[PDB]
Amino acid sequence: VKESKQKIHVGPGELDDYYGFWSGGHQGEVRVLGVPSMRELMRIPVFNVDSATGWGLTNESRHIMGDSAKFLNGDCHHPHISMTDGKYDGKYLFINDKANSRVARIRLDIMKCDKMITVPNVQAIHGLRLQKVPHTKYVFANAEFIIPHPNDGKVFDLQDENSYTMYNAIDAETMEMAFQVIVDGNLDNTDADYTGRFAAATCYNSEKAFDLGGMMRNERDWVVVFDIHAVEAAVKAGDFITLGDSKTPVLDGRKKDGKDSKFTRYVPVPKNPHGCNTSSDGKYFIAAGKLSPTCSMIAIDKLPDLFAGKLADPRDVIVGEPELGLGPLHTTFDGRGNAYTTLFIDSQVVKWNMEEAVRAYKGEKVNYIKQKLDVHYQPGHLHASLCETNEADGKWLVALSKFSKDRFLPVGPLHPENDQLIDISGDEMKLVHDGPTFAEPHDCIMARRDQIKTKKIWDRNDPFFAPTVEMAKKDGINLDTDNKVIRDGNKVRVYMTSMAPAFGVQEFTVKQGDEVTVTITNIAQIEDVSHGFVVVNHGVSMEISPQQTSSITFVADKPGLHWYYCSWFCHALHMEMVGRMMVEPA
Amino acid sequence: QKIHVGPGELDDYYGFWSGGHQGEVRVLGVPSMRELMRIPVFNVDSATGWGLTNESRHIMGDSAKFLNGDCHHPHISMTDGKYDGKYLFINDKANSRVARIRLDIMKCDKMITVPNVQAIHGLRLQKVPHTKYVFANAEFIIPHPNDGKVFDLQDENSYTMYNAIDAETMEMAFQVIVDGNLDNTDADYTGRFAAATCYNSEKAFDLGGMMRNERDWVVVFDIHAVEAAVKAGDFITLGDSKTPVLDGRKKDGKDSKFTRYVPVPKNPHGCNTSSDGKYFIAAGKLSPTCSMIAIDKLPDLFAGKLADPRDVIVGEPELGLGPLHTTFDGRGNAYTTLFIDSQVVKWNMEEAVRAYKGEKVNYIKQKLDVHYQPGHLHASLCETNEADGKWLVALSKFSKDRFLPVGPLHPENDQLIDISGDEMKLVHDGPTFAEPHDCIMARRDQIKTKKIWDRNDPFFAPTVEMAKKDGINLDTDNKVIRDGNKVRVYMTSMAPAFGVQEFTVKQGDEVTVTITNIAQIEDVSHGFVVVNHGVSMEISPQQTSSITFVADKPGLHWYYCSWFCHALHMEMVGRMMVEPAWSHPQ
Ligand code: CUZ
Ligand code: CUZ
Ligand code: CUA
Ligand code: CUA
Ligand SMILES: [Ca+2]
Numbered sequence A: 001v002k003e004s005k006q007k008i009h010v011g012p013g014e015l016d017d018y019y020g021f022w023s024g025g026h027q028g029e030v031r032v033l034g035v036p037s038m039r040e041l042m043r044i045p046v047f048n049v050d051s052a053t054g055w056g057l058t059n060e061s062r063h064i065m066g067d068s069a070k071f072l073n074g075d076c077h078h079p080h081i082s083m084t085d086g087k088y089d090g091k092y093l094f095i096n097d098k099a100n101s102r103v104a105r106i107r108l109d110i111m112k113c114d115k116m117i118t119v120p121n122v123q124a125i126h127g128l129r130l131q132k133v134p135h136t137k138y139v140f141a142n143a144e145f146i147i148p149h150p151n152d153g154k155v156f157d158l159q160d161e162n163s164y165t166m167y168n169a170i171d172a173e174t175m176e177m178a179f180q181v182i183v184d185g186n187l188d189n190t191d192a193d194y195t196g197r198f199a200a201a202t203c204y205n206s207e208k209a210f211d212l213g214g215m216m217r218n219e220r221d222w223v224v225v226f227d228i229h230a231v232e233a234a235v236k237a238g239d240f241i242t243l244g245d246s247k248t249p250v251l252d253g254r255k256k257d258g259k260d261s262k263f264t265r266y267v268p269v270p271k272n273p274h275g276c277n278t279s280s281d282g283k284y285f286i287a288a289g290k291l292s293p294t295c296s297m298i299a300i301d302k303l304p305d306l307f308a309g310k311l312a313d314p315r316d317v318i319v320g321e322p323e324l325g326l327g328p329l330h331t332t333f334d335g336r337g338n339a340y341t342t343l344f345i346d347s348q349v350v351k352w353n354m355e356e357a358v359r360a361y362k363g364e365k366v367n368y369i370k371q372k373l374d375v376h377y378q379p380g381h382l383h384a385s386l387c388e389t390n391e392a393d394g395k396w397l398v399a400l401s402k403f404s405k406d407r408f409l410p411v412g413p414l415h416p417e418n419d420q421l422i423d424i425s426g427d428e429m430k431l432v433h434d435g436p437t438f439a440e441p442h443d444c445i446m447a448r449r450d451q452i453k454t455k456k457i458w459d460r461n462d463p464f465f466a467p468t469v470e471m472a473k474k475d476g477i478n479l480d481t482d483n484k485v486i487r488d489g490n491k492v493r494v495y496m497t498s499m500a501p502a503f504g505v506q507e508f509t510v511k512q513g514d515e516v517t518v519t520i521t522n523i524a525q526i527e528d529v530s531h532g533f534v535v536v537n538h539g540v541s542m543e544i545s546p547q548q549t550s551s552i553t554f555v556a557d558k559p560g561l562h563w564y565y566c567s568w569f570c571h572a573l574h575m576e577m578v579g580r581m582m583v584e585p586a
Numbered sequence B: 001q002k003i004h005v006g007p008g009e010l011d012d013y014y015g016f017w018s019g020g021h022q023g024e025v026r027v028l029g030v031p032s033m034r035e036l037m038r039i040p041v042f043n044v045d046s047a048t049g050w051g052l053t054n055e056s057r058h059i060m061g062d063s064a065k066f067l068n069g070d071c072h073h074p075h076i077s078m079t080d081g082k083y084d085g086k087y088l089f090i091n092d093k094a095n096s097r098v099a100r101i102r103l104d105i106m107k108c109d110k111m112i113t114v115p116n117v118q119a120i121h122g123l124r125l126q127k128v129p130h131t132k133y134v135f136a137n138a139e140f141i142i143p144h145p146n147d148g149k150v151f152d153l154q155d156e157n158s159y160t161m162y163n164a165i166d167a168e169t170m171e172m173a174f175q176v177i178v179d180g181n182l183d184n185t186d187a188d189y190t191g192r193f194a195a196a197t198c199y200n201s202e203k204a205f206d207l208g209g210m211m212r213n214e215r216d217w218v219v220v221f222d223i224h225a226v227e228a229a230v231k232a233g234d235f236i237t238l239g240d241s242k243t244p245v246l247d248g249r250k251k252d253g254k255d256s257k258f259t260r261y262v263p264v265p266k267n268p269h270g271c272n273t274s275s276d277g278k279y280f281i282a283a284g285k286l287s288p289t290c291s292m293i294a295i296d297k298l299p300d301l302f303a304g305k306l307a308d309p310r311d312v313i314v315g316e317p318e319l320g321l322g323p324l325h326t327t328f329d330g331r332g333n334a335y336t337t338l339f340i341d342s343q344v345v346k347w348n349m350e351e352a353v354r355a356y357k358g359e360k361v362n363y364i365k366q367k368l369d370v371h372y373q374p375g376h377l378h379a380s381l382c383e384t385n386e387a388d389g390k391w392l393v394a395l396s397k398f399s400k401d402r403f404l405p406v407g408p409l410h411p412e413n414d415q416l417i418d419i420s421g422d423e424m425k426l427v428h429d430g431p432t433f434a435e436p437h438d439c440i441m442a443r444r445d446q447i448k449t450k451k452i453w454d455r456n457d458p459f460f461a462p463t464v465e466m467a468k469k470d471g472i473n474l475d476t477d478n479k480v481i482r483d484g485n486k487v488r489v490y491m492t493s494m495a496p497a498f499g500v501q502e503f504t505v506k507q508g509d510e511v512t513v514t515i516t517n518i519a520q521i522e523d524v525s526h527g528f529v530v531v532n533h534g535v536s537m538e539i540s541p542q543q544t545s546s547i548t549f550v551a552d553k554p555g556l557h558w559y560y561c562s563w564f565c566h567a568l569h570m571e572m573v574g575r576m577m578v579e580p581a582w583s584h585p586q
């Protein structure tokens, strides 16, 4: 007998217990929440263009985005925190972009996106999870959609032998591709084991169809299990191919005339399975049945025997297949031996015991279902605190529901998502908070307060703006002191320090048509004294926080006087923290 | 007074938060302070496609080239000094715009770039007899014309202008040239008078010059005189704009027909009409006071029946350091933010008026500490004669230690305060991104939203018109129209299938995809994303949306529905096949 009795109210002056990291959904950012208050503490721009900080307008952000800076949209689903020894280490957050096929990395000490990669030769990065053990060496990323190779417009057929999709491994530390694995079918969600050897992904389009009925024809698709040691062995030996102009090593994980690859095993699982979730004790890859009212439990301890050819049938690694309810999509864990699964159709979370499910699969008459909690409505992902680590603490559960209906005030034709906080600390799940969120966060991740350490002010050698320091070095500028205008043909490079309530350069003059770069270094050493910089009617906007350098480039295409001002309320004289750009006519 | 809104309870008030330099408008539930919706206005929204869609870019006009905005002041249209819930208006300081949000669909439906001005800052609505005019301050003095021959702010032709926009047509109504500059503004409860603070009576560009004079002023406008001069044809026009321009400057000590300038210390900021309609209250900022302009003495002031403009001041209470903004409980109390002292000061307006007459009386009732450095504040219904004295939001600029650390950039602290009793009670600390400057609350029953679009809605009527030229009936048709190197795809959508699941174009074709969501159910929104083309939009029930992009890459390119709509949402996809350029002419 233990009761669910956790306090939910975080009063003024009190602090939240957990950080929540929410996908921004189709809006494209990452959002930082306090838990259990469910209040949004910060937005981290990633694939969106952020007017406030200038992400997507500044030179530093467009350098990180690369050529993909041309896109103003993203679609993210799956945020995950880097691990060491199966526990969060607080270093990085990774997230996917399904719209323009990217992975981004966020540095959790500065809460900014610091690296971004377009995954080559694929369309639509969806499933994403991190190696757990010995640490996050790889980011694993699913590309969802089968495409021709090459995709040059000569072949459009999905059934062609060179039409396929690929599992992707990115080096977490360098954010360069490590390798790709061609698979049969497609890829939905993915997870990793607690040794580093195995990773697994669900597949819903084993049929390689494009139409709705075609994609639901097979009784069973599969989860494909990857032998990462075997992949690495082959890469280290040089037996791989490359595709197109990408140097990425490409391994072939497809079955060929019935024969298995060294790199993959295909475990039949019903049906168009969706979630693929590693239990916190490291025993199971759990695939959520979706169209089948089940979850399928893959025993990780049997996978070495599967890849060694010691098992008669790939189904022999299935050790449980509990019937739970209508539309199982995702599973999480309290670390006490229970699994928690969203039922999309039944609109519930079901709590169930994994070892009892395994015994029931053997034919014991034991009831493994503990509780079904109604949620509102149609839940997708769910997340129990520390569930992706061997420290899963079984305290908080968030269920992320796609139809809010009447749970909030009406706000027009478009509705918010209902992210519901559930106390799981005791024997009964208890619903304690409905949190409306914009643009469908799909999944979220929680960390203990003590797992996250942030910088209070920037470091001057920070890699985030190191290329700007370099540019200034070429101009002979000491960013910490200098207030100067460099003229270079039709290029003008203003460098200034800023200190509330004044810009260090308060006027400058240019010729109509000049390309202007303005670089600002906030030399305050006080926490929270951010400055802004907006050029009126030029579409120019950016943030400069304490000890940061930020820069932005625009063309002075309009003759005349053009004011600039500080956008971040910084000082009693903030309205007067302004300057003039004077543009002499052509 | 209920503080906490439990699961399945609804908030009692809507709150409309400015998005600050992030450029959107945010809809909150009060008192829970949870964000229910984001309304993109000057930002590019990846989720809905605002800034990318043809409908949004049509509304933005040429300003669709800007990806940024800076908004501060949201206000709800009024009829007879009460909110009518028709429209929300907000300013853009970064690119000199005013936007209108239609509160039934919670979307920006009109936008205007105010001509011949720089930086739209202060903004407020006529109250009586209804909101005919939107009043908008241009904050910065510029040359006229601003063609790069004159840069000096002291030139005869260097000034800023007060701006009146027709609320219903969102076209310019008139502009009034003023001395000095403009900061905030408000309107009386008769329709005759509006008023604006000025902090740069010096027409300087540096900090000390802008602070030189002991008093700047509140400039009062006689809208009846302006209206009479425009009907009489007595105005000029500037540049290309047909907007009537009237001259509200003093010339040679002589007052204009349209303006009177009331001396007020010092670099005053806020400008707030009391809910009883008696006073324009100006916040003294650098002066530790507010200045109360008796609106009933204004007709006498404009008729030359007063010896000194100061004679319309009937109060100047000393309140504390850095008064910025004032709001009203409707019980004769005013609440003022003290930026430097970091407090809200509650004071009795009539008692302050007696103390100005010499009658010693303590008009200050309470000073509540806020965290930290408050800017604007807002009491529920404060801008109407229905000011109800229940809730107070103070919007503080430095949150320091009030929330978990999230890096060098800190959230703001919007603190909800109970003012229903004699004593202000701090009840909730609400972190917000990008510095909302101001907000506005409305009773739940003052807002009526549509659950599904009307098919004749002007938001997409231009698109319906385009479709008619192609002979399309958007409600039923699934057709691909070809026109040279343009392709216009029209389709219906019903979960979980796109009405046109595949189409083929030539490389380089300009593709418009128009989608009509023909669902009748609430909350069934679809999305549309073209992988790797930077294309993303929302289509809510009975909406038509369209987006245009270049099919610049040969090959097969997937599109998918981004808005979780169904159990088969992962499977709602389509294919664009792009034939290579080398296989087609040129
Ligand atoms: Cu992309 S899917 Cu269940 Cu993860 Cu939301
Ligand atoms: Cu623009 S000012 Cu007190 Cu409104 Cu914030
Ligand atoms: Cu710098 Cu406001
Ligand atoms: Cu249509 Cu999801
Ligand atoms: Ca299938």
Ligand SMILES: [Ca+2]
Pocket (backbone or CB within 6 Å): B199, B200, B201, B202, B209, B210, B211, B212, B213, B215, B216, B266, B267
């Ligand atoms: Ca002044």
Ligand SMILES: [Cl-]
Pocket (backbone or CB within 6 Å): A189, A190, A274, A275, A276, A277, A330
């Ligand atoms: Cl998953």
Ligand SMILES: [Cl-]
Pocket (backbone or CB within 6 Å): A336, A338, A426, A427
């Ligand atoms: Cl338990």
Ligand SMILES: [Cl-]
Pocket (backbone or CB within 6 Å): B184, B185, B269, B270, B271, B272, B325
């Ligand atoms: Cl104001």
Ligand SMILES: [K+]
Pocket (backbone or CB within 6 Å): A402, A403, A404, A415, A416, A417, A440, B564
């Ligand atoms: K939704």
Ligand SMILES: [K+]
Pocket (backbone or CB within 6 Å): A530, A568, A569, B397, B398, B399, B410, B411, B412, B435
């Ligand atoms: K701030």
Ligand code: NA
Pocket (backbone or CB within 6 Å): A064, A066, A115, A116, A117, A118, A175
């Ligand atoms: Na990169």
Ligand code: NA
Pocket (backbone or CB within 6 Å): B059, B061, B110, B111, B112, B170
């Ligand atoms: Na317009």
